[PDB]
């Protein structure tokens, strides 16, 4: 038929475009960036009640000051995460310092579009684009706390808050209302919980959504169930009020 | 059946290779360009369509030199011309390295020909979207060559390709009859500038800039040089005179 | 150098070669595993296409990877062999370079990665296989069970099943596994496994295979008789109704 | 046999004051008993407030100074013009140098 | 319906290359950017487009050496590859020859780079448009790069969404912006004025405005945020 | 379906259509050539069609000097003719370097035949649309004519002809040898052999020629040369008794 | 480009089956029938030559029965040439094992290697599978007598009795009826011939259309003999059963 | 030189390995175990060039352990030793040969026989009642040639070894800090808890 | 350059046929008839030297080729595919046999080797099967005389006598009722001469017919003397005068 790297008549990459479709099919992940830090949440979305909910890992640590959230075909994200980890560490080996969040993200994105069937130059070795997207959260000393959306188009954008996956637009619209420049971190937490509860198929609880944050002080922590469960309760009471 | 025109290597049932012929269309859709073998050299000229006033004049050069003694001009897809000239350059360097002498014009044509021909052998490449007019001076005299996307080339008394080829062609035909002695290099220059103006009618809608070069034993010592300044102006003037 | 992209996206965002690989799994003989309080059992189903089959030399459905971890599959057979070799080698290499045997999760994550790579590489098709990987960590008493799909996704399971009519057995399982009271003995666990399998395979105690993993490399495959006694006991407990 | 190394003399010196730093070198370049030049400086400004001297075999010392200046520029490209910190510069030079662990730069480097 | 656009290796019976033409279209979708030059300077001005009011504006200006840089309209990762390859040839020029690379020369390099991707199977053409400015040994320079591999030197131009408004402006004020030598703050205002002929319909914020300047007394420098408030 | 038409695989009738369409191409130039053997010479006549008056007629040829001893005439489009020409020159010089003697006319035909055969069997090479007639006065064989085609065939001939009017020319010649009952032109001089060759070309195309309508190669013991129009003119006049 | 002509030989059908393997199995269904039966004191291999003329040579011919070891034979159903490529490979593997370990290769290990190769052709490299099924007969000291089957999918199984090629449903049903664990080699020989007698797509079973081999223990305990039957032997044993 | 000794008695194989590790002028360790277990019933002792010995040993262990799981079979001692012999014969002609000497001691559970194999760094393998690498033979072979009986108990074989180590401890310039003794029989592999 | 056909050009159809092999086989059927016969003390292979134009040269048309001084081959089908196959065949007899054991391969082994080359063309990426069938006749010391047929599939079989190409079915039937296992070489030549007659449409003489024998050792054809252990080639191509001479029967 046609190439895996061909243009549509509207000047779009078919395979890239079709990959964004697989992504909207994925579990929801949201990030909000405050000045006290950055928060990331994901909808675990378990297939069967026999599945161990702990074994679902959609928020991963890249370096001590960089966290990741994923949505899409999550098997595709394993090697991207590996390359991101290798990159932040290699950079530290070469320069005795933390890699900038921007630069790390730029390095992951380079990894995309590296697909095809013999594109004359070097080696575009990969049959298809990645079918997963990342929210890359981080801090550095030059640009403070930061949130990034990394698509399979090798493109990346900095958001102040951003949702991806099933009901991003739903979530995104809700974010566009609730986000202001002076959000506390504890606010941003409840906010992520709220917006997840709206768009999640199941009812929200510590067992089917997971929360994390990256703070300058402590770096990247993923919250435990007891910790998260308590923030669910915090919101339930908040929401029973005019 | 059909579909013989979809891959770059397929013979159609009348021994043809349609992808080469479609390439020829890319050529035909292009700017006019000509060559004139004078009596001790050659002259090259090409029509630079001025799309707008924003285009910086005198720049955006199109004629290219290969080594020091060969001029190349082409019509069609310009990046394809450039690619071809890069190859010509490595192929001329390679010749001079082994053999010391600058590459003789016919040998250089065969090098270009076998390369172009070679892109009509496989379906993993596309043919060349250009026709090239090239040549210059060696130890056997002046030589003018034209080369199509099929890899076909021959030696010409005069040559033309692009949108206005037939104006130029018929026009060039005149001089062949009228001067069996040949032209002055000096004469062929002005004579070339007229022909671009003539063959411009097929593109008369848009504005244009003329570009000439020449390679002549008495006039440039065997080296391909551009015509610029008070001789370019003189030949432009000579072209305006034969019109209105 | 065949590098044609066989696994690509289609406009709905599906990868059809990975999905057709799942179909190959549904076709394969059912497989199940359930986690005891201090064991894991693997139950599989014997093919009943033909007999005159030599039983002592036909490849069993459960494979030891290291001495403390087993893998069972569902789907293409020839495909599963390749996956098994790769992991057995990684089990050794991991021990050679880190002086520890693989954790069950590590090995799962390894196999998963291999499959994933085949969904994204020129000239190869994904694996027509889905796997259950079970055992105990080195120096650990807590049981481990993981499943793997042709897309390269893996996760942990209190109990789980794959292949033909796995959808049925999964239903039985979610209506029979109290996560707060796992079959706190080898017997209770081996029993619950047969109960699930048997209600899809039909009477054949020759159509069922069982393997039991206990802590510290205690791995034992049972003879039909041990299984036949397990069949017979629930025919009766049912025929008491 | 061919000897890929030579010695061009020179001495350099670097001192750290508590809010400043100096790096000095003579300007004579020699070979054996001959003076090649009375003025051929070997202490360089490489931007980002970093001065660097690679003294020993002059070809190697030149080559190394070129590579580092060029790695400052690429650092800038690759990290939105972040200033190269002196400690990062030093660690980067380690890697530059160690790249030729089995065909070394015949120089002693101070920044 | 048409069978001549599944790869870049196929001529239509008209003599066209649809895959190249499609990539051309990717550019026009990309947000507008404008280039112009006097004799002492060359300015890039680019309208970076966001996705959300929650998002950032895509950097459209890339620095290639100290005397050269470019603006991108189109598929971004392709401007990365292309610009990065330009940083390399600029570098090679300086390392091996101690010679700042001619702006013309970089233009030819881009053309030959892009051409290769339009004659060989399995490749795709570049889906990005680039405008390149620089000050070299022959003054200020502006270049327009197309993924077909067509590069032109021009006093001014624009590429992208509603590019034609700015481009028309430039065509008429040409006698006036080329004669503004030795005054860059005004060559910027003239550049910003041309880019306002392509707004439909938004106001230039500080967040979406991106100017780049390079000239006789100035190395390629990119102005963003507060630094551009001055021209609003 | 419709693909055994595009690449050199078999049709269900056992044919290679791509080869046939390549044979089709040999005639695209509308030129006729013929070759004939003297006692100690070998002649090739070919038509010379210059249509544009803007062309340099010295550069328009389909006769190639391959080595000092071997002449080659091509029927087909010039760029394939030149591709074959270069490869035969390369091959004939290599052969000399490796084996210490001049590459014989027939050996070179066989070698080019095998190269042609390769394109009929590999899908990525197209056949070349040419027929190659090789002539020489070989030191072991004598006057020699060997011909190759896009199928990969190679054959020696007493005499031969190629192009659109080839059957006319072949029948013409056949008749003469049938009459004379020898496999060659019993003539001591190559001039009178090229004259026979011209005559039988004129008497079968039903056209007359000037000096610029023809091309002539002669092969002698250790030399192959092409004639000037001025010498062609000389035989042309002599032809008109 | 060339992507068009690509049959895509290693893709899954929407039901998750492999076209070429499925189709290859079909090919094998048209091939001469071959049978393996394992007795308590041996293995029998019997096979029907698909083609025969009266001019064909009987003794000088092989198409069904091949030695791999001095301990392992195969019976072939399918593309003869595709089988020899796979046979030679297996023969080399067994020697590799012997050179490494100074022990003869256990039958299964040889069988697994060979199935793994077939398996590869169905997962990468864009090539057609081998159009071959193999019945394996052999002895090792870990499991004694063994009987294996392998097919184009790269799948293998162990058997007491098994058939490949044409009319396997008929043959399987027949062996299933008369097979007993306590069978001796003389019994299995007869059961094999008689199963072939009732599945032949041809009128009567003669010696010259049959190939025969047996793997025994013989007179000397410890050694195993491979007997590949001569035409006259096959003929004689045909007489000693209720045939001819 | 490092001490590598072995003797196979009636129904068991005994391996004795020196415990010293010396880097130039210091004895860095006195508690070194110069053996790897290959199978439950196969032990390999090794001595030679510093890095090569353990790298080789562990490489061989991995390969035997992988074979074992792949087949659920424990390869025979003769087979294990043919594998090792080929691995050294490959390396002797490689770019940097492993300079390692080995004894293989194993109980062939199939034949109920102890077997002992001696192989040097260059692939020379031989099967022996008793063997030693390096200088170790020069002191002890006159002792074994004398006292060795094919029908010795393990106790007798342990005594014969005790003699050998004494001869070594008195005539050898180097202090090898004693030996570790290991037995491979039908019940597998055990280390003599106290020797000398 | 850039050979991108790494995928196979012969696939299995759903019926289970290998199309390209069937088609190749078909191209053989339409080829000129050639035949072989095994006698007690020799082999003969024969074919028609069908001249296109009578301007073409008869000798130049070889269809009968020495492979080994004791092995000959002939074919039906696409002649260029054959010429190529002959040269691979001769080279392989040296490369995988003469240069290793110091003697020429036995006839069956050389055959299985040609078979190998052919099989690969039915499976390797980017190629079509060969459009030929060969009959190959030889004598080695341990198998004596033998005659094989090799097809584009890679399959081969030994024959007492056979034929391929156009008139194969008639020829095979005629051969079947004239072959006994007590023919001298000379008899089998005569029979081959008969069987060819039917298939040869037109002129039938020593210049339109090609014939080879794999027979006795010709120490007259050795080229050297002095090593009694080295006898002549057993292969001999008959002369037109030889054929014509016994055409009087």
Numbering used by the authors:
A (entry chain S): 9 to 250
B (entry chain U): 4 to 247
C (entry chain R): 3 to 243
D (entry chain 1): -9 to -1, 1 to 102
E (entry chain T): 3 to 234
F (entry chain O): 10 to 250
G (entry chain Q): 2 to 245
H (entry chain Y): -1, 1 to 195
Can you provide the manuscript's text about this entry?
The proteasome is a proteolytic machinery that executes the degradation of polyubiquitinated proteins to maintain cellular homeostasis. In the present study, we show that HPDs constitute a novel class of PIs with a unique mode of proteasome binding. In contrast, we have demonstrated that HPDs act on all three catalytic subunits of the proteasome by direct binding to the active pockets of the ß1, ß2 and ß5 subunits with a similar binding mode and kinetics.
To understand the mechanisms of proteasome inhibition by K-7174, we determined the X-ray crystal structure of the yeast 20 S proteasome in complex with K-7174 at 2.5 Å resolution. Analysis of the structure revealed that three molecules of K-7174 bind to and block the active sites of all three catalytic ß-type subunits, ß1, ß2 and ß5, with a similar binding mode, consistent with the biochemical data. The electron density of K-7174 was well-defined except for one trimethoxy-phenyl group near the ß4 subunit, which was partially discorded. The overall binding is determined largely by hydrophobic interactions between K-7174 and Gly47, Met97, Asp118, Gly130 and Ser131 of the ß5 subunit as well as Arg22 and Gly23 of the ß4 subunit. We also observed that, despite some difference in binding interactions, the active sites of the ß1 and ß2 subunits are blocked by the trimethoxy-phenyl group of K-7174 in a similar fashion to that observed in the ß5 subunit. These findings are fully compatible with our conclusion from biochemical analyses, and confirmed that the trimethoxy-phenyl group, but not the trimethyl-phenyl group, interacts with the active sites of three catalytic subunits via hydrogen bonding and the pentenyl arm (C - 5) fits the hydrophobic grooves between ß subunits via hydrophobic interaction. Three molecules of K-7174 bind to the active pockets of the ß1, ß2 and ß5 subunits along hydrophobic grooves in the direction of the ß7, ß1 and ß4 subunits, respectively. In contrast, these mutations should not affect the affinity of K-7174 to ß5 subunit, because the binding site of K-7174 is spatially distinct from the bortezomib-binding pocket. Crystal structure analyses revealed that K-7174 interacts with ß subunits largely via hydrophobic interaction, whereas bortezomib binds to the ß5 subunit via a hydrogen-bond network, explaining why higher concentrations are required for HPDs compared with bortezomib. K-7174 similarly inhibited all three subunits in a dose-dependent fashion, whereas bortezomib did not affect trypsin-like activity but efficiently inhibited chymotrypsin- and caspase-like activities.
